[PDB]
mmCIF file of C-alpha atoms in Angstrom:
data_model
loop_
_atom_site.group_PDB
_atom_site.id
_atom_site.type_symbol
_atom_site.label_atom_id
_atom_site.label_comp_id
_atom_site.label_asym_id
_atom_site.label_seq_id
_atom_site.Cartn_x
_atom_site.Cartn_y
_atom_site.Cartn_z
ATOM 1 C CA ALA A 1 0.010 0.024 0.032
ATOM 2 C CA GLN A 2 0.933 3.738 0.142
ATOM 3 C CA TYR A 3 1.058 3.735 3.861
ATOM 4 C CA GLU A 4 2.613 0.470 5.306
ATOM 5 C CA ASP A 5 2.916 -0.828 8.862
ATOM 6 C CA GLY A 6 6.690 -0.985 9.576
ATOM 7 C CA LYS A 7 7.376 1.790 7.043
ATOM 8 C CA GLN A 8 5.835 5.299 7.877
ATOM 9 C CA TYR A 9 4.600 3.994 11.272
ATOM 10 C CA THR A 10 4.712 1.081 13.452
ATOM 11 C CA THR A 11 1.923 -0.657 15.357
ATOM 12 C CA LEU A 12 2.260 -1.003 19.204
ATOM 13 C CA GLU A 13 2.307 -4.786 20.096
ATOM 14 C CA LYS A 14 0.730 -3.662 23.343
ATOM 15 C CA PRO A 15 -1.857 -1.051 22.546
ATOM 16 C CA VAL A 16 -2.474 1.614 25.250
ATOM 17 C CA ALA A 17 -6.119 2.042 26.414
ATOM 18 C CA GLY A 18 -7.488 5.526 26.939
ATOM 19 C CA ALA A 19 -4.461 7.271 25.317
ATOM 20 C CA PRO A 20 -4.689 10.813 23.932
ATOM 21 C CA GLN A 21 -5.606 10.889 20.257
ATOM 22 C CA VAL A 22 -2.416 12.433 19.109
ATOM 23 C CA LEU A 23 0.429 12.381 21.651
ATOM 24 C CA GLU A 24 3.871 13.910 21.064
ATOM 25 C CA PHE A 25 6.914 13.496 23.377
ATOM 26 C CA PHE A 26 9.983 15.749 23.516
ATOM 27 C CA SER A 27 12.801 17.124 25.538
ATOM 28 C CA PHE A 28 14.081 20.621 25.725
ATOM 29 C CA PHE A 29 17.552 18.814 25.692
ATOM 30 C CA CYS A 30 16.702 16.897 22.507
ATOM 31 C CA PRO A 31 18.545 18.222 19.436
ATOM 32 C CA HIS A 32 16.088 16.649 16.926
ATOM 33 C CA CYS A 33 13.219 18.070 19.022
ATOM 34 C CA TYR A 34 14.699 21.547 18.603
ATOM 35 C CA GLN A 35 14.634 20.897 14.869
ATOM 36 C CA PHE A 36 11.091 19.512 14.969
ATOM 37 C CA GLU A 37 9.806 22.544 16.910
ATOM 38 C CA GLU A 38 11.898 25.408 15.889
ATOM 39 C CA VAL A 39 12.831 24.570 12.237
ATOM 40 C CA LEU A 40 10.304 21.996 10.891
ATOM 41 C CA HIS A 41 7.302 23.141 13.034
ATOM 42 C CA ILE A 42 5.975 19.557 13.175
ATOM 43 C CA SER A 43 3.443 20.035 15.970
ATOM 44 C CA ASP A 44 1.877 22.871 14.001
ATOM 45 C CA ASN A 45 1.740 21.399 10.699
ATOM 46 C CA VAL A 46 0.137 18.275 12.149
ATOM 47 C CA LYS A 47 -2.472 20.526 13.828
ATOM 48 C CA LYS A 48 -3.494 22.221 10.661
ATOM 49 C CA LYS A 49 -4.228 18.881 8.956
ATOM 50 C CA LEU A 50 -6.030 17.019 11.818
ATOM 51 C CA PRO A 51 -9.733 16.216 11.360
ATOM 52 C CA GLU A 52 -12.305 18.155 13.360
ATOM 53 C CA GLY A 53 -12.630 16.813 16.783
ATOM 54 C CA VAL A 54 -9.138 15.348 17.400
ATOM 55 C CA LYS A 55 -7.047 17.199 20.009
ATOM 56 C CA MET A 56 -3.229 17.319 20.252
ATOM 57 C CA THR A 57 -1.208 16.621 23.397
ATOM 58 C CA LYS A 58 2.433 17.239 23.953
ATOM 59 C CA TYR A 59 4.484 15.960 26.898
ATOM 60 C CA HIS A 60 8.051 16.541 28.200
ATOM 61 C CA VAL A 61 10.231 13.602 29.256
ATOM 62 C CA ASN A 62 12.661 12.909 32.083
ATOM 63 C CA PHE A 63 15.178 10.641 30.545
ATOM 64 C CA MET A 64 17.473 13.339 29.078
ATOM 65 C CA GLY A 65 19.343 15.912 30.920
ATOM 66 C CA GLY A 66 19.409 14.521 34.566
ATOM 67 C CA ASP A 67 18.165 16.761 37.126
ATOM 68 C CA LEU A 68 17.503 19.700 34.923
ATOM 69 C CA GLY A 69 15.591 17.395 32.667
ATOM 70 C CA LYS A 70 13.187 16.632 35.500
ATOM 71 C CA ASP A 71 12.879 20.350 36.320
ATOM 72 C CA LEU A 72 11.944 20.932 32.732
ATOM 73 C CA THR A 73 9.152 18.245 32.883
ATOM 74 C CA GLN A 74 7.828 20.098 35.906
ATOM 75 C CA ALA A 75 8.215 23.459 34.208
ATOM 76 C CA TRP A 76 6.385 22.072 31.248
ATOM 77 C CA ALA A 77 3.532 21.054 33.575
ATOM 78 C CA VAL A 78 3.423 24.683 34.788
ATOM 79 C CA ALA A 79 3.343 25.745 31.077
ATOM 80 C CA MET A 80 0.378 23.494 30.519
ATOM 81 C CA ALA A 81 -1.463 24.467 33.745
ATOM 82 C CA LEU A 82 -1.169 28.224 32.930
ATOM 83 C CA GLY A 83 -1.719 27.747 29.280
ATOM 84 C CA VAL A 84 1.481 29.406 28.180
ATOM 85 C CA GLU A 85 3.083 26.789 26.071
ATOM 86 C CA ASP A 86 3.122 29.079 23.093
ATOM 87 C CA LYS A 87 5.101 31.707 25.028
ATOM 88 C CA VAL A 88 7.835 29.636 26.710
ATOM 89 C CA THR A 89 8.551 26.795 24.130
ATOM 90 C CA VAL A 90 10.876 28.974 21.969
ATOM 91 C CA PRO A 91 12.935 30.506 24.864
ATOM 92 C CA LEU A 92 13.219 27.213 26.707
ATOM 93 C CA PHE A 93 14.596 25.457 23.646
ATOM 94 C CA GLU A 94 17.017 28.433 22.787
ATOM 95 C CA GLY A 95 17.933 28.714 26.449
ATOM 96 C CA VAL A 96 18.899 25.119 26.673
ATOM 97 C CA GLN A 97 20.410 24.583 23.243
ATOM 98 C CA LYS A 98 21.224 27.859 21.600
ATOM 99 C CA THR A 99 22.494 30.316 24.237
ATOM 100 C CA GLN A 100 22.957 27.566 26.852
ATOM 101 C CA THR A 101 21.672 29.964 29.590
ATOM 102 C CA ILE A 102 19.465 27.567 31.306
ATOM 103 C CA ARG A 103 21.505 25.616 33.908
ATOM 104 C CA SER A 104 19.135 25.628 36.971
ATOM 105 C CA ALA A 105 15.522 25.797 38.074
ATOM 106 C CA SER A 106 15.882 29.404 38.594
ATOM 107 C CA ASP A 107 17.172 29.973 35.112
ATOM 108 C CA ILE A 108 13.986 28.120 33.842
ATOM 109 C CA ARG A 109 11.794 30.383 36.025
ATOM 110 C CA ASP A 110 13.545 33.458 34.543
ATOM 111 C CA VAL A 111 12.159 32.361 31.153
ATOM 112 C CA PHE A 112 8.701 32.533 32.407
ATOM 113 C CA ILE A 113 9.100 35.794 34.091
ATOM 114 C CA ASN A 114 10.637 37.244 30.959
ATOM 115 C CA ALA A 115 7.552 35.847 29.158
ATOM 116 C CA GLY A 116 5.403 37.823 31.401
ATOM 117 C CA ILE A 117 4.191 35.307 33.861
ATOM 118 C CA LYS A 118 4.115 36.774 37.362
ATOM 119 C CA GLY A 119 6.704 35.284 39.709
ATOM 120 C CA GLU A 120 4.242 34.722 42.384
ATOM 121 C CA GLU A 121 1.923 32.896 39.893
ATOM 122 C CA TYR A 122 4.748 30.806 38.634
ATOM 123 C CA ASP A 123 5.783 29.770 42.065
ATOM 124 C CA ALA A 124 2.246 28.961 43.174
ATOM 125 C CA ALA A 125 1.837 26.768 40.132
ATOM 126 C CA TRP A 126 5.312 25.130 40.422
ATOM 127 C CA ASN A 127 4.360 24.058 43.926
ATOM 128 C CA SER A 128 0.750 23.125 43.228
ATOM 129 C CA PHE A 129 -0.759 19.632 43.423
ATOM 130 C CA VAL A 130 -2.455 20.287 40.043
ATOM 131 C CA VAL A 131 1.060 20.624 38.598
ATOM 132 C CA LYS A 132 2.187 17.448 40.533
ATOM 133 C CA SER A 133 -0.693 15.524 38.849
ATOM 134 C CA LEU A 134 0.243 16.979 35.467
ATOM 135 C CA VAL A 135 3.827 15.720 35.987
ATOM 136 C CA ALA A 136 2.235 12.337 36.904
ATOM 137 C CA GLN A 137 0.300 12.346 33.564
ATOM 138 C CA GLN A 138 3.346 13.037 31.553
ATOM 139 C CA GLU A 139 5.360 10.378 33.284
ATOM 140 C CA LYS A 140 2.479 7.741 32.939
ATOM 141 C CA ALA A 141 2.035 8.325 29.235
ATOM 142 C CA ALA A 142 5.712 7.850 28.551
ATOM 143 C CA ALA A 143 5.758 4.783 30.648
ATOM 144 C CA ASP A 144 2.648 3.347 28.866
ATOM 145 C CA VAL A 145 4.453 3.283 25.542
ATOM 146 C CA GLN A 146 7.784 2.217 27.126
ATOM 147 C CA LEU A 147 9.349 5.407 25.694
ATOM 148 C CA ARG A 148 13.113 5.259 25.051
ATOM 149 C CA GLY A 149 13.622 8.243 22.685
ATOM 150 C CA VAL A 150 12.393 11.512 21.542
ATOM 151 C CA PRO A 151 11.079 13.106 19.419
ATOM 152 C CA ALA A 152 8.083 10.501 19.179
ATOM 153 C CA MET A 153 4.532 10.751 18.144
ATOM 154 C CA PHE A 154 1.748 8.297 18.917
ATOM 155 C CA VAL A 155 -1.719 8.163 17.480
ATOM 156 C CA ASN A 156 -4.682 6.741 19.492
ATOM 157 C CA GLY A 157 -2.330 4.728 21.753
ATOM 158 C CA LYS A 158 -1.960 2.341 18.770
ATOM 159 C CA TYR A 159 0.427 3.741 16.161
ATOM 160 C CA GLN A 160 3.941 5.223 16.385
ATOM 161 C CA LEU A 161 5.246 7.615 13.805
ATOM 162 C CA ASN A 162 8.393 6.397 11.921
ATOM 163 C CA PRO A 163 10.048 9.483 10.282
ATOM 164 C CA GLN A 164 13.113 7.498 9.319
ATOM 165 C CA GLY A 165 11.174 5.920 6.514
ATOM 166 C CA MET A 166 11.061 9.489 4.851
ATOM 167 C CA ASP A 167 12.975 11.688 2.433
ATOM 168 C CA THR A 168 14.577 14.814 4.272
ATOM 169 C CA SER A 169 16.134 16.339 1.101
ATOM 170 C CA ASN A 170 13.454 18.960 1.194
ATOM 171 C CA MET A 171 12.346 20.028 4.745
ATOM 172 C CA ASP A 172 8.774 21.151 3.581
ATOM 173 C CA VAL A 173 7.948 17.829 1.805
ATOM 174 C CA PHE A 174 9.092 15.873 4.874
ATOM 175 C CA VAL A 175 6.914 17.957 7.260
ATOM 176 C CA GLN A 176 3.765 17.529 5.018
ATOM 177 C CA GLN A 177 4.477 13.807 4.624
ATOM 178 C CA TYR A 178 4.675 13.539 8.460
ATOM 179 C CA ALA A 179 1.482 15.593 8.887
ATOM 180 C CA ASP A 180 -0.399 13.610 6.059
ATOM 181 C CA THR A 181 0.738 10.421 7.891
ATOM 182 C CA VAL A 182 -0.758 11.545 11.236
ATOM 183 C CA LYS A 183 -4.013 12.345 9.387
ATOM 184 C CA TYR A 184 -4.131 8.968 7.764
ATOM 185 C CA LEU A 185 -3.401 7.266 11.086
ATOM 186 C CA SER A 186 -6.117 9.439 12.672
ATOM 187 C CA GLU A 187 -8.751 8.291 10.300
ATOM 188 C CA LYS A 188 -7.874 4.654 10.767
#
């Protein structure tokens, strides 16, 4: 066929019940994730092609960057709780990988402050149980698919995108192939 299991996607031997419809995993430490988000804009091009009614979820992971990696999973929970993902994603990526100015939880916090989130609001969220449960959700989702690498995307807890079966000579064509594949998998 045009889309083949084992080529543009693989099927989870052990499907995950109750999984988000489209679930993307990343780390702010992950060089290919920087490309996906800052250069390719994968998340955004997938969104523009998703059928009506299917929502997109994006989670941070712990297994890169040690202690700072975990701080970033908690910061990403804060980002989701306050709904400020679109304001901190670029400076977090650039702070970790471009300027390398993020070395501590306080440096992470500075990013939010600079983005206009009140210190007192950031701190309340950081320490909140609502954020603890969001950290838990992120950890559980990654655990459910036995996640060992990022970037990664999963559709309906059943299918895992496989970008390595794709031509990268043109960055545009790769992104739309990726997006079109998510749409196809979504309609399965």
